C-alpha cells in the first residue's frame, strides 16, 4: 500500500502530524486543528498520554510500550509511532513504516520520508513505541472540505474586474501579434522595393498600436492591483474577525507568531486566488494561438521550439524539489543564529560579569558559517539551474536561426518570415514558461490554504454556549462550586473536588500556596474554561443557566499581569462600554488613588500612552486597572494582585474604597501576603487544590490548623 505522510504546519505538531499520517494510511482523513484539540497539544510539546487518549477516543486501540532492541522479533504491528532526539537537542516524533534487511523507512514531519539504517537509528531514538490497531468503531471516511474553492468564492462578486482583465489581455495579445509581424512586412516589401512613402506611412501606423498596447497594460495593472488589494483586505478581515471569536484554549495552546503569520499567509493565498487563475486562463489560449500561428509559419521550426520548451520543462521539474529542500534548510539554520544574537544581547550583563566574551564570539561564528554554507548550497543549485536554462535557450536560439537559413537556402519559406518567426517565438514561449513555472506557486498556495483555512473550521464560544437570557436579569445571590473538577489540559488535575459556598454580600479572601490554583478558579468563575464534572450554581441555577454576555458584563477581573493598551488613558478606562459621563471616571480615579498622578501628566486625560504604557510605573498601572475594574460597576469584583505595590497608605485607601460600597456586591480577593487580608468575614485556605479551612479568623486560629502554621511561616 502507498505510504502517506503529512507535513507539520508549525513546529510543535509532531504528535498530530503522526496521528494524521496513520489515519490517512488506514483511510480516515480528519482536520488537523481538530486533531490538535483532540491530542491536547501545548506550546512546550505533546505528551504521549495525550496522543494515546486521542487515539482511543478516535476509535484506535493504542498502547504505549517500552522497547530495547526488540524490533527484530515478529511480535509487532506496523506502522508505529516512535520518539527520537536530534543529536540531544530536542525531542521529536517520527513514524516507522517497515523494517527489513536492517534498513528502515520512517516518516518525519520535519522533512518527509527519510531512509535510516539500524545502527544510526538505534543511536538516534532512546526508547518508546506507540502501537495503533484499527478498532471496531473505526469508520473510514473523509472529513475535510476543500478550502481552495472556499477561498476562491470571493471572486464570485468580482466577475466584472476579471472579465475586463481577460478582454484587455486578449486585445493586448491581438495588438502584439501585429507588432511581431511588422518586421516581416519591413523586410519583404518595404526594402526590396524602394518605396519610401509607404515606409513612412507604415512605420507611423505601426507605432500607435504600441501606444494602445501600453494603455491596455496600464489598465490591466490598475485592475489587477485593485483586485489584489480588495482580496487581501477581505481575507484579512474574515480571518481576524473569526480569530477574535475563538475560545481561550486556542490562544493558550498556541503561541503569538503562529497566529500572526496567517496574516502574511493571506497574500500567499491571494497569489493563487487572483494571479494564478487569470494567468493560466489568458496564457493557455494565448499560447494555443501563438503555436497555431507558428505552425502556419513553419513545421520544423515549431517542432524545434516544442523540443526546446520540453527540455526546459524537464529541467525545471527535476530541479524544483532541491530548491524547496535547500530553502527549508536555510530557513531552519538562520532561525537559530538570530535566537543566539537576541539571547546574547539580552543577557549581556551576565556575559560581561562572567567574562564569557570569547566563548560567545566563537559560538556565534560557527552558526554564521553554517548559515553561509546553506546559502552557498542554495547558490550552487541556482547557478546550476541558470546555467542549464541558459545553455538550452542559447542552443535553441542558434538552432532556430540555422534551420531557418537552411530552409531559405532550399527555399521552403520567404527570407523575411524567419524574423517574424523569431519575433513570435517570444509570444509563444512566455505563456508556456509561465505555466511551467506556476507549479511551485500552486503547491505553496494549496499548502497555505490548508494551513490557514484549517482554523476557520473551529467552533467559537457563541455556538458552544446555550441560552439563558429569557429569565436572567442580574448576577446576585449565593455562589456554589459543587464537585468542580478541572484539568488545565491533558495533564494531572490542578483543581480537585470542592464544595465552596460564597454567601451574599460577603468579602471573600482566597489564600493558598504560590503553586496552588487560585487564579484558575477565578478563570472558571467567569467561564473562560469548562469544567469536566461538577457545576457552578448561582441562585440555584447552573453555569449552563447564565447568559454569556451577562457573565462578561457583570464580572470585573484584575489580572495578575496587567496589560495597558496603546492610546489615550480615557480610552483605556472606558473601553467596551460607551456613553459614560466623566463623573464616573473621576470617582473611579479618586477611589483608585489615580487622580493624584494623572494630573501631573502633560494632558489631563488625553495623554497618549505609547509603548503599551511602559513609561508609567507598575503601581500606576495597578491604579489604572482598579479604576477600569470599578468603572463598570460589576456584580462580581475579583481582585488578584492589586496590593502588590503600595506606599504603606495606598493599601489603606483601597481597603477603605472596597469597604465603601453600600451594596451587596461580592468581592473576592486572591491573597499572597496575609497582612493585607485582615478583618475578613470569610477566608478560604487552599492546599493541594483543596480548600481546607472555611470560617472567620478567630475560630480557625483557635482550631490550631495549617492556617496558623502558615502564620508561623510568614512571621
Amino acid at each position: 500500500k502507498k505510504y502517506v505522510c503529512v507535513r507539520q504546519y508549525d513546529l510543535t505538531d509532531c504528535g498530530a502530524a503522526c496521528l494524521s499520517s496513520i489515519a490517512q494510511y488506514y483511510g480516515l482523513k480528519m482536520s488537523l486543528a481538530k486533531i490538535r484539540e483532540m491530542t491536547g497539544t501545548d506550546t512546550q510539546g505533546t505528551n504521549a498520554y495525550g496522543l494515546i487518549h486521542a487515539a482511543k477516543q478516535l476509535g484506535f486501540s493504542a498502547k504505549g510500550v517500552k522497547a530495547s532492541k526488540e524490533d527484530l522479533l515478529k511480535d509487532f504491528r506496523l506502522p508505529a509511532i516512535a520518539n527520537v532526539i536530534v543529536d540531544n537537542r530536542l525531542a521529536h516524533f517520527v513514524v516507522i513504516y517497515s523494517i527489513k534487511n536492517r534498513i528502515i523507512t520512517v516518516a518525519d514531519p520535519g522533512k518527509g520520508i527519510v531512509r535510516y539504517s539500524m545502527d544510526d537509528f538505534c543511536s538516534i531514538w532512546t526508547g518508546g513505541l506507540v502501537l495503533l490497531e484499527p478498532g471496531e468503531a473505526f469508520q473510514k471516511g473523509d472529513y475535510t472540505q476543500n478550502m481552495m474553492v472556499k477561498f476562491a468564492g470571493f471572486l464570485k462578486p468580482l466577475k466584472k474586474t476579471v472579465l475586463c482583465i481577460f478582454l484587455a489581455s486578449l486585445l493586448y495579445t491581438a495588438l502584439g501579434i501585429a507588432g511581431s509581424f511588422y518586421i516581416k512586412f519591413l523586410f519583404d516589401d518595404l526594402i526590396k522595393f524602394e518605396k519610401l512613402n509607404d515606409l513612412h506611412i507604415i512605420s507611423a501606423g505601426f507605432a500607435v498600436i504600441f501606444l494602445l498596447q501600453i494603455f491596455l497594460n496600464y489598465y490591466r495593472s490598475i485592475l489587477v492591483t485593485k483586485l489584489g488589494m480588495s482580496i487581501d483586505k477581505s481575507i484579512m478581515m474574515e480571518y481576524y474577525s473569526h480569530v477574535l471569536k475563538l475560545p481561550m484554549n486556542f490562544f493558550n495552546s498556541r503561541k503569538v507568531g503562529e497566529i500572526i503569520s496567517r496574516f502574511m499567509d493571506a497574500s500567499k493565498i491571494r497569489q493563487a486566488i487572483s494571479g494564478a487563475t487569470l494567468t493560466i486562463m489568458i496564457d493557455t489560449i494565448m499560447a494555443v494561438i501563438g503555436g497555431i500561428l507558428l505552425y502556419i509559419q513553419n513545421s520544423s521550426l515549431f517542432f524545434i521550439s516544442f523540443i526546446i520548451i520540453l527540455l526546459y520543462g524537464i529541467i525545471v521539474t527535476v530541479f524544483n524539489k532541491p530548491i524547496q529542500n535547500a530553502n527549508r534548510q536555510i530557513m531552519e539554520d538562520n532561525a537559530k543564529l538570530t535566537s543566539a544574537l537576541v539571547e546574547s544581547v539580552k543577557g549581556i550583563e551576565t556575559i560581561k560579569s562572567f567574562g564569557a566574551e570569547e566563548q560567545t564570539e566563537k559560538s556565534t561564528r560557527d552558526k554564521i558559517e553554517t548559515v553561509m554554507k546553506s546559502s552557498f548550497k542554495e547558490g550552487m543549485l541556482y547557478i546550476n539551474l541558470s546555467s542549464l536554462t541558459g545553455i538550452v535557450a542559447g542552443l535553441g536560439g542558434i538552432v532556430i536561426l540555422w534551420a531557418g537559413a537552411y530552409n531559405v537556402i532550399k527555399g521552403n519559406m520567404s527570407g523575411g518570415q524567419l524574423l517574424a518567426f523569431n519575433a513570435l517565438l517570444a509570444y509563444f514561449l512566455t505563456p508556456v514558461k509561465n505555466l511551467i513555472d506556476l507549479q511551485p506557486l500552486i503547491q505553496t498556495a494549496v499548502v497555505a490554504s490548508n494551513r490557514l483555512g484549517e482554523i476557520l473550521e473551529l467552533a467559537t464560544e457563541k455556538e458552544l454556549r446555550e441560552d439563558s437570557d429569557d429569565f436572567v436579569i442580574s448576577l446576585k445571590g449565593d455562589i456554589e462550586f459543587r464537585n468542580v473538577d478541572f484539568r488545565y489540559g491533558l495533564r494531572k488535575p490542578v483543581l480537585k473536588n470542592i464544595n465552596l459556598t460564597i454567601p451574599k454580600g460577603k468579602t471573600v479572601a482566597i489564600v493558598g500556596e504560590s503553586g496552588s490554583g487560585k487564579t484558575t478558579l477565578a478563570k472558571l468563575l467567569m467561564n473562560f474554561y469548562s469544567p469536566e464534572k461538577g457545576d457552578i450554581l448561582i441562585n440555584g441555577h447552573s453555569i449552563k443557566n447564565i447568559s454569556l454576555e451577562l457573565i462578561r458584563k457583570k464580572i470585573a477581573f484584575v489580572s495578575q499581569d496587567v496589560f495597558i493598551f496603546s492610546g489615550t488613558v480615557k480610552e483605556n478606562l472606558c473601553l467596551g462600554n460607551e456613553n459614560v459621563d466623566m463623573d464616573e471616571i473621576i470617582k473611579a480615579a479618586k477611589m483608585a488613588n489615580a487622580h493624584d498622578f494623572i494630573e501631573k501628566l502633560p494632558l489631563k486625560y488625553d495623554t497618549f500612552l505609547n509603548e503599551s504604557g511602559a513609561n508609567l510605573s507598575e503601581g500606576q498601572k495597578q491604579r489604572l486597572a482598579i479604576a477600569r475594574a470599578l468603572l463598570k460597576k460589576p456584580d462580581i469584583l475579583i481582585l488578584d494582585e492589586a496590593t502588590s505595590n503600595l506606599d504603606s497608605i495606598t493599601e489603606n485607601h483601597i481597603k477603605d474604597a472596597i469597604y465603601g460600597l453600600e451594596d451587596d456586591v461580592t468581592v473576592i480577593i486572591i491573597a499572597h501576603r496575609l497582612s493585607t487580608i485582615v478583618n475578613c468575614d470569610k477566608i478560604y485556605l487552599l492546599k493541594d487544590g483543596e480548600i481546607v479551612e472555611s470560617g472567620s479568623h478567630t475560630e480557625l486560629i483557635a482550631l490550631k490548623g495549617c492556617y496558623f502554621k502558615m502564620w508561623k511561616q510568614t512571621e
Partner: peptide, 17 residues
C-alpha cells in the same frame, strides 16, 4: 504484545515537539 506496558506516570514523561 511486544513488551510490558508502561505506567501512566512514566507515560507522561514522553514528550514531543
Amino acid at each position: 504484545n511486544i513488551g510490558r506496558e508502561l505506567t501512566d506516570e512514566e507515560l507522561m514523561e514522553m514528550t514531543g515537539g
